[PDB]
């Protein structure tokens, strides 16, 4: 990433590579600098650890910019979809349920993987059954949209599911 350009080259003899890939051989530092000045480009230190240090004639700022661009673009096509979590309930009912389902559908369409969780309270005798059932129902509703990933799982006071979109 960070290279010691122009006058940060203390090294006495440097192996100079041109603007295109033309090897200008083993050169003096001063000579290299002069050459760089002539092109109106920087003399970059791309090989500090190599014998007669591998020094490149290039526009350094531009290169840096390019690198930055590369970094940035990569982190969208690497961040590249996330986990939306819906937290249902026990005695959950009609309209609200439908709304939640709709939300889930929308998320799936978007491309975001779905944690289908339920936060619980107490009276964990009834809890596993109905909770499981609701989740299963939800999955069935979206078997035309999503693949079942993490099947019914306890997290202590929670019960979580996970869905992913069919064609990504």
């Amino acid at each position: 990433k960070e290279y010691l350009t122009n006058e940060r080259i203390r090294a006495k003899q440097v192996r100079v590579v041109g603007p295109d890939g033309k090897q200008l051989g083993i050169m003096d530092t001063r000579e290299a600098l002069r050459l760089a000045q002539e092109m109106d480009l920087d003399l970059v230190l791309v090989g500090p650890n190599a014998d007669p240090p591998v020094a490149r004639i290039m526009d350094y700022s531009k290169w840096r910019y390019e690198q930055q661009m590369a970094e940035k673009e990569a982190r969208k096509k690497a961040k590249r979809t996330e986990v939306k979590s819906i937290k249902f309930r026990v005695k959950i009912d009609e309209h609200d349920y439908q709304t939640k389902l709709g939300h889930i559908k929308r998320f799936l369409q978007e491309g975001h993987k779905v944690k289908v969780t339920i936060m619980f309270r107490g009276r964990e005798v009834a809890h596993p059954e109905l909770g499981e059932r609701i989740l299963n129902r939800v999955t069935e509703d979206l078997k035309d949209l999503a693949v079942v990933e993490m099947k019914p799982e306890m997290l202590g006071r929670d019960m979580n599911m996970l869905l992913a979109p069919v064609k990504v």
Partner: protein, 71 residues
């Protein structure tokens, strides 16, 4: 007098409505809006859909009962 014809029948809790009025699918047959007892209200006893509660049902019209026993 106090005319006692009250049917003391058990049932699984079905649908949690407002006011703690629980539809209870009885061991007798059809579910009705059977509400919670005063005792239960006093002692602070939460029922969830998933318990086998005793509902004290009337013979005049089997549409309303009373959840007496805790689960």
């Amino acid at each position: 007098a106090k005319e006692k014809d009250t049917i003391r029948t058990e049932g699984v809790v079905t649908e949690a409505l407002p006011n703690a009025t629980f539809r209870v699918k009885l061991d007798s047959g059809p579910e009705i809006l059977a509400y919670i007892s005063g005792k239960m209200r006093m002692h602070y006893i939460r029922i969830l859909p998933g318990d086998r509660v005793v509902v004290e049902i009337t013979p005049y019209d089997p549409t309303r009962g009373r959840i007496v026993y805790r689960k």
